[PDB]
Symmetry: D2
Subunit: 116 residues, 4 copies
């Protein structure tokens, strides 16, 4: 429950379905270690990536594979992916929704951070 990703398509006005998402966590030696991955559902949501126990303090990167999404719709987009990089749980455990809104040459991302 502590990390969820939601992806919307600004061209079609719909969830962005079947988008690949890779999460990484910065290690002590400053490299990016693979942490979790998955794909968005029919609702454009990806749940279940991690657990309260596993999701410790750290710097996390959420890489959303926007380029494969657009190419499967016949569009050659600008970006390789959308990356969202952030420190998590620095003030204690929180619940993070990482939302992204996609267009071929543009994206936006926002975080909704809540305290259970």
């Amino acid at each position: 429950c502590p990390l969820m990703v939601k992806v919307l398509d600004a061209v079609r006005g719909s969830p962005a379905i079947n988008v690949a998402v890779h999460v990484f966590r910065k290690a002590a030696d400053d490299t990016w270690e693979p942490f979790a991955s998955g794909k968005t559902s029919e609702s454009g949501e990806l749940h279940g990536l991690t657990t309260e126990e596993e999701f410790v303090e750290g710097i996390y990167k959420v890489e959303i594979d926007t380029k494969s999404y657009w190419k499967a719709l016949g569009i050659s987009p600008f970006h390789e992916h959308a990356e969202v990089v952030f420190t998590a749980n620095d003030s204690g455990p929180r619940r993070y929704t990482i939302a992204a809104l996609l267009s071929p040459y543009s994206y936006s991302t926002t975080a909704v951070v809540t305290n259970p």
Copy 2:
């Protein structure tokens, strides 16, 4: 000079050219009075809408005809237009750029207010 509008296209990655823009000022009876209008340039910009003397404090509406733009590109849009409504304030900075970034089902707008 005090008011400029800049419009970008998030699908094509380009200025949004030949977009109609109408500006209105709110009247004492709360109706919207036509004030200025134009079409964006090849750089997506619309300059020269008003003057320093004319652009007095008040509530203004900038209406961007996004629907006609998407229709021209053959892409089904959601909005009828994008409307940006704001109060012009003499105390702060003196130049207003109203920027808008367009997608068929989404738009964003920001104000860049400077001296």
Copy 3:
């Protein structure tokens, strides 16, 4: 169920709570008639505005009172409100989520349109 409004705050990373929302529908004489209104909940969502029977084809305007929201947080924002104007149900009944992401000098809006 056919019209929902969801509002997020891009400064705090949270739902935008207690935001006033007024919906209007363009009448045959081309004026804006009041249609529904409400305020966002603790989750930043406003449900229950209308019904499948009432929400006929038409041009609708959703006016989100962003200026009162920012002022109560001590911020003097740029916009008077965010307005979202759109034709609804032109191809038959649909389910519309109107989402808005707010900052003091900027907002974005997107629509998620689904077919039940």
Copy 4:
């Protein structure tokens, strides 16, 4: 000339000034090689990063240090930075403007690619 970065501040309604920006090119071993960097100007712009000859096709990353910017304003930010990753392509248009609009918990970016 072929690559420019423009950064805006959605809280203050202003250019985002003195923002550090680093550009990287992806190497054959998939590491990120430093390529160019600078700080945005009083207009929020960073010009002169590269040249027509140097800016060959490849995968580029533009990393905008948003966290330091919000720290300077005393506002708690979410992201460590904003990263924009793209392939540069000779067939299409020749000038790339990478624009970004910053809020403490959100950012948006668009590419304006023109001749």
